[PDB]
Design an enzyme around this catalytic site. Structure first.
Site, PDB file in Angstrom:
ATOM      1  N   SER A 234      -5.365   7.447   5.952  1.00 53.13           N
ATOM      2  CA  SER A 234      -4.348   7.118   5.133  1.00 53.13           C
ATOM      3  C   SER A 234      -3.788   8.040   4.349  1.00 53.13           C
ATOM      4  O   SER A 234      -3.533   8.809   3.904  1.00 53.13           O
ATOM      5  CB  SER A 234      -5.137   6.171   4.528  1.00 53.13           C
ATOM      6  OG  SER A 234      -5.404   5.116   5.016  1.00 53.13           O
TER       7      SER A 234
ATOM      8  N   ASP B  70       0.867  -1.004  -0.130  1.00 49.60           N
ATOM      9  CA  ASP B  70      -0.295  -0.188  -0.264  1.00 49.60           C
ATOM     10  C   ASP B  70       0.823   1.085   0.131  1.00 49.60           C
ATOM     11  O   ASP B  70       0.949   1.908   0.558  1.00 49.60           O
ATOM     12  CB  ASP B  70      -0.467   0.071   1.127  1.00 49.60           C
ATOM     13  CG  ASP B  70      -2.296   1.056   0.950  1.00 49.60           C
ATOM     14  OD1 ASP B  70      -2.479   1.942   0.178  1.00 49.60           O
ATOM     15  OD2 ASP B  70      -2.869   0.682   1.940  1.00 49.60           O
TER      16      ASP B  70
ATOM     17  N   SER C  45      -1.643   3.250   6.845  1.00 51.70           N
ATOM     18  CA  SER C  45      -2.790   1.913   5.421  1.00 51.70           C
ATOM     19  C   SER C  45      -4.158   2.015   6.184  1.00 51.70           C
ATOM     20  O   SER C  45      -5.136   2.100   4.937  1.00 51.70           O
ATOM     21  CB  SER C  45      -2.319   0.514   5.283  1.00 51.70           C
ATOM     22  OG  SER C  45      -2.796  -0.350   4.559  1.00 51.70           O
TER      23      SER C  45
END
Lengths: 187, 4
Positions: A143, A62, A158
């Site tokens: 995020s 991510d 994340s």
């Protein structure tokens, strides 16, 4: 934008993690599920574009990176949302038991402890591997925010499974993997 | 767990 600061693209708000550099140029890294949504990023909802996406990876990882295109040279710091900032000067991997902080644009700075490293996390979109679990509280819009301890960059926020009081579940992507993926360093 |  400073680390932990708001960024906007695709009509959504995310947060930047850290300002990074290669070849004398400036970039910021953020979450891959954020750079997957848009190529152009602004520092307010209908503001001018400050940068364009150069890479993204979500799920599996991510992380993503945005090249600044507005000619700015931002300081390599993380916003502490209190008038001051944390200077970042290295990057490392977090370890179990370490006291960490995260800075993002929804819950600003919260703190917690790392409880596990190298974790696979199943999101609805798919699994993301080699993640780090912490007890720091977080919420949507955080995020891409900075996970850090002192001047050390540790991760890119994340997601989480919720928070009540101070008992959070913030998950981060190790920042070292994004820095190697793009050949960039913090400053 | 959910992305934020």
């Amino acid at each position: 934008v400073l680390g932990g600061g708001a960024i906007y693209g695709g009509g959504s708000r995310c947060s930047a993690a850290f300002n990074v550099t290669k070849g004398g140029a400036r970039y910021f890294v953020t979450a891959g599920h954020c750079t997957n949504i848009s190529a152009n990023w602004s520092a307010s909802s209908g503001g001018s574009v400050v940068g364009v996406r150069e890479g993204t990876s979500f799920p599996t990882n991510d992380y993503g990176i945005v090249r600044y295109t507005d000619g700015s040279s931002p300081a390599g710091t993380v916003d502490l949302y209190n008038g001051s900032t944390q200077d970042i000067s290295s990057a490392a991997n977090a370890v179990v038991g370490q006291a960490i902080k995260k800075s993002g644009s929804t819950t600003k700075v919260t703190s917690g402890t790392v409880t596990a490293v190298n974790v696979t996390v199943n999101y609805g979109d798919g699994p993301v591997y080699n993640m780090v679990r912490t007890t720091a509280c977080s919420a949507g819009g955080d995020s891409g925010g900075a996970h850090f301890a002192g001047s050390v960059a540790l991760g890119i926020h994340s997601g989480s499974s919720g928070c009540s009081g101070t008992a959070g579940s913030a998950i981060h992507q190790p920042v070292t993997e994004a820095l190697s993926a793009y050949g960039v360093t913090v400053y | 767990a959910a992305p934020e």
